[PDB]
Amino acid sequence: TDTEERLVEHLLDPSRYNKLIRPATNGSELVTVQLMVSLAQLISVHEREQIMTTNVWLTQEWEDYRLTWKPEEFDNMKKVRLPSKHIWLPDVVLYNNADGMYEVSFYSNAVVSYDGSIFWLPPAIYKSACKIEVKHFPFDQQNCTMKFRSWTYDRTEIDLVLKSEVASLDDFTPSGEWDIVALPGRRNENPDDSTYVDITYDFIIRRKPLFYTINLIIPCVLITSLAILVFYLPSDCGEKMTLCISVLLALTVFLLLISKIVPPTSLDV
Amino acid sequence: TDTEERLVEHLLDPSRYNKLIRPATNGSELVTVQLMVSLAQLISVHEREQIMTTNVWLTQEWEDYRLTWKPEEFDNMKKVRLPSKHIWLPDVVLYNNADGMYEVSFYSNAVVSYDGSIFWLPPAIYKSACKIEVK
Amino acid sequence: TDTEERLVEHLLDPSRYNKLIRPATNGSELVTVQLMVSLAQLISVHEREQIMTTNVWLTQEWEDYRLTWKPEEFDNMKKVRLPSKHIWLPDVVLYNNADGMYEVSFYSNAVVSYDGSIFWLPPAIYKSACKIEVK
Amino acid sequence: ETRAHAEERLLKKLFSGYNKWSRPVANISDVVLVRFGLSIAQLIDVDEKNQMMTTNVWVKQEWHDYKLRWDPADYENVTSIRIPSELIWRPDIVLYNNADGDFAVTHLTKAHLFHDGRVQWTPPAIYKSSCSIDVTFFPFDQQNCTMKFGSWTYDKAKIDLVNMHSRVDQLDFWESGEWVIVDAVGTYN
Amino acid sequence: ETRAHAEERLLKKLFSGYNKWSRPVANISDVVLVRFGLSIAQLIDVDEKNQMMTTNVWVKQEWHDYKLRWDPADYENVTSIRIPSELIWRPDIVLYNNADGDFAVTHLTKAHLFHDGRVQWTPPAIYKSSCSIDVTFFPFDQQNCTMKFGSWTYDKAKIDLVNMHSRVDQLDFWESGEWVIVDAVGTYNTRKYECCAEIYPDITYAFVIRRLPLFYTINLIIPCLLISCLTVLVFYLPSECGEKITLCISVLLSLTVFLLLITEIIPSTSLVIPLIGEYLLFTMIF
Numbered sequence A: 001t002d003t004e005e006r007l008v009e010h011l012l013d014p015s016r017y018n019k020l021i022r023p024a025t026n027g028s029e030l031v032t033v034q035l036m037v038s039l040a041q042l043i044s045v046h047e048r049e050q051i052m053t054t055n056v057w058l059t060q061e062w063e064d065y066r067l068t069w070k071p072e073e074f075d076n077m078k079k080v081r082l083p084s085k086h087i088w089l090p091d092v093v094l095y096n097n098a099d100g101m102y103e104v105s106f107y108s109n110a111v112v113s114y115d116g117s118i119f120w121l122p123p124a125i126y127k128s129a130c131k132i133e134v135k136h137f138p139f140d141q142q143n144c145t146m147k148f149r150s151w152t153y154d155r156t157e158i159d160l161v162l163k164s165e166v167a168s169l170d171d172f173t174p175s176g177e178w179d180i181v182a183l184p185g186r187r188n189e190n191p192d193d194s195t196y197v198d199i200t201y202d203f204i205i206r207r208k209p210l211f212y213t214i215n216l217i218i219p220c221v222l223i224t225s226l227a228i229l230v231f232y233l234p235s236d237c238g239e240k241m242t243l244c245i246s247v248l249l250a251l252t253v254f255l256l257l258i259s260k261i262v263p264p265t266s267l268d269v
Numbered sequence B, C: 001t002d003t004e005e006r007l008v009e010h011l012l013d014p015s016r017y018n019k020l021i022r023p024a025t026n027g028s029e030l031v032t033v034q035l036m037v038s039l040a041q042l043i044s045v046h047e048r049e050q051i052m053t054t055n056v057w058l059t060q061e062w063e064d065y066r067l068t069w070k071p072e073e074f075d076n077m078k079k080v081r082l083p084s085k086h087i088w089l090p091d092v093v094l095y096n097n098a099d100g101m102y103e104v105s106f107y108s109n110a111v112v113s114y115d116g117s118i119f120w121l122p123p124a125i126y127k128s129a130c131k132i133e134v135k
Numbered sequence D: 001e002t003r004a005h006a007e008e009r010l011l012k013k014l015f016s017g018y019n020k021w022s023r024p025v026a027n028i029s030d031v032v033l034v035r036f037g038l039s040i041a042q043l044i045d046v047d048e049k050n051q052m053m054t055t056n057v058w059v060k061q062e063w064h065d066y067k068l069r070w071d072p073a074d075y076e077n078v079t080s081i082r083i084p085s086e087l088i089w090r091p092d093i094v095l096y097n098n099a100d101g102d103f104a105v106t107h108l109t110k111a112h113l114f115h116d117g118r119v120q121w122t123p124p125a126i127y128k129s130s131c132s133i134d135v136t137f138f139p140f141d142q143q144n145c146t147m148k149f150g151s152w153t154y155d156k157a158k159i160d161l162v163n164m165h166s167r168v169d170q171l172d173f174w175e176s177g178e179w180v181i182v183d184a185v186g187t188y189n
Numbered sequence E: 001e002t003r004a005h006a007e008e009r010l011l012k013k014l015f016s017g018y019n020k021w022s023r024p025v026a027n028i029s030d031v032v033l034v035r036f037g038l039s040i041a042q043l044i045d046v047d048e049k050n051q052m053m054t055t056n057v058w059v060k061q062e063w064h065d066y067k068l069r070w071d072p073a074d075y076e077n078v079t080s081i082r083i084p085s086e087l088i089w090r091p092d093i094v095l096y097n098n099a100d101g102d103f104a105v106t107h108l109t110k111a112h113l114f115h116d117g118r119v120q121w122t123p124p125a126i127y128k129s130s131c132s133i134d135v136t137f138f139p140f141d142q143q144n145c146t147m148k149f150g151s152w153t154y155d156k157a158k159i160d161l162v163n164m165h166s167r168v169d170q171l172d173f174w175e176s177g178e179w180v181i182v183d184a185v186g187t188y189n190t191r192k193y194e195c196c197a198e199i200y201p202d203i204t205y206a207f208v209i210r211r212l213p214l215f216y217t218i219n220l221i222i223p224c225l226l227i228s229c230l231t232v233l234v235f236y237l238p239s240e241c242g243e244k245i246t247l248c249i250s251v252l253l254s255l256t257v258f259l260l261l262i263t264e265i266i267p268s269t270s271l272v273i274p275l276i277g278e279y280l281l282f283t284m285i286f
């Protein structure tokens, strides 16, 4: 419509609106940013490389007083869509990312209300590093964290705040290999820094052990049960060495296969 | 050369050249594009994935009537290089590519002749799908 | 300084300097480029893939008569650092590359002397095709 | 007189006061009906281990822009023009269940614009999507891999999707020799 | 009256006649002192076969720009601002011994500019640097991989480097579980290159890293010792059992396989021989 394009031109007019400047009002105040992580799918956990891949929708909500308008002057329009690349954003990124990809994947539009409220929900494929615990494999439970911070602004310029104490699973696709246990979120300050703030999500996932049970543990038990037969084999048969050497070979091969499955870390066996 | 700078400014003046318009006047006539693939190297043939990788130059020639000049007015210049991103291009791509890389790799300069003949030789690395016969 | 920024603004002014044109004074005159290769490290030789990876510094020296200035008019400045992305460059590439990487890796600053001499020494990680004799 | 001169005039007229960030509807209550279809160039890979399907498709999209209209009689009977897709408003259709690829179309080919306001945009795209793999009867197994497409930021009251055709177009399909498509149908939800 | 409006005015003022290609000194004889330091986020990989170290570091840089100063009293007490780092002059610090990566920082995060002209820039980078690997005492080996940083085109009289802190920062270090950092110290050096007549400084960081040997112990050493326990058994087997050949052949082939496994880990360098390799080769010979 003519009114919508007039409004969009008015809001993004570079002469009146600079996207490089924080929308701080009342003086040396801080912009409050609300975060909410929505887990759409747990794509994979790579134990060997210790990387978790997720498909998340990152809700970011703040207020920009410069993106305000009066609905009466604009045909009673209450909200508009603006390209996120043309407005100020709080540069919230996944700080503990592996593969060096900090930002979201798409940069969708931002829904702007007439009162300056901003609602941004970009999607993202994230690769985060996490510490794999190998002791109880394949009956292991993992704890992979996702740390979100602004790599532009410190706590004196913006304040990160959780919208909910947990991550949303409203539109989640079940994994098949991993079971979701808990997805709590926490806002962390530093008592000795005062410029540090982050929001961290703990992904408590639990492996479903059937696949590795059947494909690794039962064969291992079967080979192990053969370790005692050499002592019931008569010496005249002339096949003791064959049996015990074969058992040792199979056991070593299984040891090496397990070594190739788990990460090559030395903290635990 | 100052003359070449003057010629380049004259040819690509926005008031007389729009690269969004196909050089076809007097009705929607056809712009004939002459194509020639020159194989620089057969990089590899991955049979497991059935993908052939090649290094080629996708030679393309066509006539742009708007890029003509009188050589006598420009120190008898009969050819000039123009950046291919600033002229109308025939968007010739590799349709049967695997990995989804359609376009050329570099977008080199085009050699425009005084009569409007364009000669463009962009390099390209292509990954094309093909049927492997394992018999 | 104020003088240095005045000089750099004058030199790179797109109004008077077109980085897309060869710095040839006459139509038949040719630009001589001096090349020297400095091998920082021989990273790897992959016999199976037939590729040699090297870390080399590629010296390139030429003259651009358009990037001249008089030192007395610029506080006796004898040379300046200009971004190589904003001056005319000879598109010297590794032609027999094995990874589709033709250009240098960094595009460092070019050192420009008041008489038009350009000194450019970008670093590069090169992967060149090599026929391997395994006998 | 020449077609080129009339086309230059038309292009200057069309984009004089055009805003590509505004939904192109004359009246706010109108809905932008986007006719959406898929044509599969080839089924590049079905990764059972990683449960990803890689496809090469053409994302066929058609809609009406009320500002990109003209009378061909005033422009030497020019009935349509090809324009870069980055000059005009486009729907932001993304693949929901993306895995290891791009959410949106990135190639941005030229759009075909007709004098009645119709826009036809058919860019290519490589998509890597998640699909649950069932190997109960492997190697005699039949898989069912889905691709979910929708506007990311416009609700049904603003952008509505229309199924161009029931079945994915396979006229230019490059047969793989490992997999056979039994049925590919789009379902509106 | 609002901080945003004052910041807009300040930005208009600062970049009125700013040239990002000119070295930011008031006098040509002044040197730009760049306080340089590294903060390591995680040791991504030590590739012994290819002799490369992959690291994720924050490249802390800090210099003074003489044209980016203002009086906060004139701008609603705005004391500092964040600006895109691509709008200002930046030092061209590059990693000399790059291998399979990038020479310079590529992310180009925003810079923190202070009213007194101080610029702080802390971009992230992933560096893949070459280092000589010595596996004499593998898997109980200690590696010494270096990273050489310095300006590429400005000599010591134009840009000089200052060690922010001799020790590399590990306050936000993500522990690997495979290596431990014994020592990570940066050393300031100057030297002349045949390219150029001036002196170019650099800071070289030496990462002394110790391998945690439990994983390779369990997976290689112990199986090798168990096989080694059986090397002499053939001489106690009676000739009537008809199984001497089976045992000795099995031992030989197992040792050969384990030697091949070790070969796939260590670099193919001819300067040192791993002790494990020598032991396996001698056992195979006997």
Ligand SMILES: *[C@@H]1O[C@H](CO)[C@@H](O)[C@H](O)[C@H]1NC(C)=O
Pocket: D027, D028, D029
């Ligand atoms: C838009 O459509 C609504 C619904 O029919 C109508 O009430 C309104 O008058 C229309 N606006 C204009 C400007 O025609």
Ligand SMILES: *[C@@H]1O[C@H](CO)[C@@H](O)[C@H](O)[C@H]1NC(C)=O
Pocket: D077, D079
């Ligand atoms: C206009 O062009 C169309 C084809 O695009 C043709 O069918 C029609 O006859 C033409 N009309 C005139 C008046 O030239």
Ligand SMILES: *[C@@H]1O[C@H](CO)[C@@H](O)[C@H](O)[C@H]1NC(C)=O
Pocket: D144, D146
């Ligand atoms: C494939 O899956 C879709 C949605 O999950 C379902 O509607 C359809 O019936 C399935 N078809 C087969 C053959 O499994």
Ligand SMILES: *[C@@H]1O[C@H](CO)[C@@H](O)[C@H](O)[C@H]1NC(C)=O
Pocket: E027, E028, E029, E030
């Ligand atoms: C710059 O420094 C030199 C060395 O101290 C001095 O001779 C010269 O006068 C200075 N220039 C200005 C403009 O102060």
Ligand SMILES: *[C@@H]1O[C@H](CO)[C@@H](O)[C@H](O)[C@H]1NC(C)=O
Pocket: A028, E077, E079
């Ligand atoms: C200016 O702001 C600083 C904090 O950045 C504060 O310490 C100082 O008191 C303020 N001064 C005035 C005059 O407001």
Ligand SMILES: *[C@@H]1O[C@H](CO)[C@@H](O)[C@H](O)[C@H]1NC(C)=O
Pocket: E144, E146, E206, E208
């Ligand atoms: C590591 O190497 C550096 C540079 O070669 C040297 O200065 C340092 O002493 C070495 N340290 C050890 C423990 O080998």
Ligand SMILES: CC(=O)OCC[N+](C)(C)C
Pocket: A057, A108, A109, A111, A120, A121, A122, D151, D152, D153, D154
């Ligand atoms: C408004 C917005 O960005 O919504 C994104 C999520 N989606 C596509 C499920 C509505």
Ligand SMILES: CC(=O)OCC[N+](C)(C)C
Pocket: C057, C108, C109, C111, C120, C121, C122, E151, E152, E153, E154, E193, E195, E196, E200
């Ligand atoms: C001036 C110039 O480009 O020097 C590059 C080489 N280096 C870093 C050894 C001096």
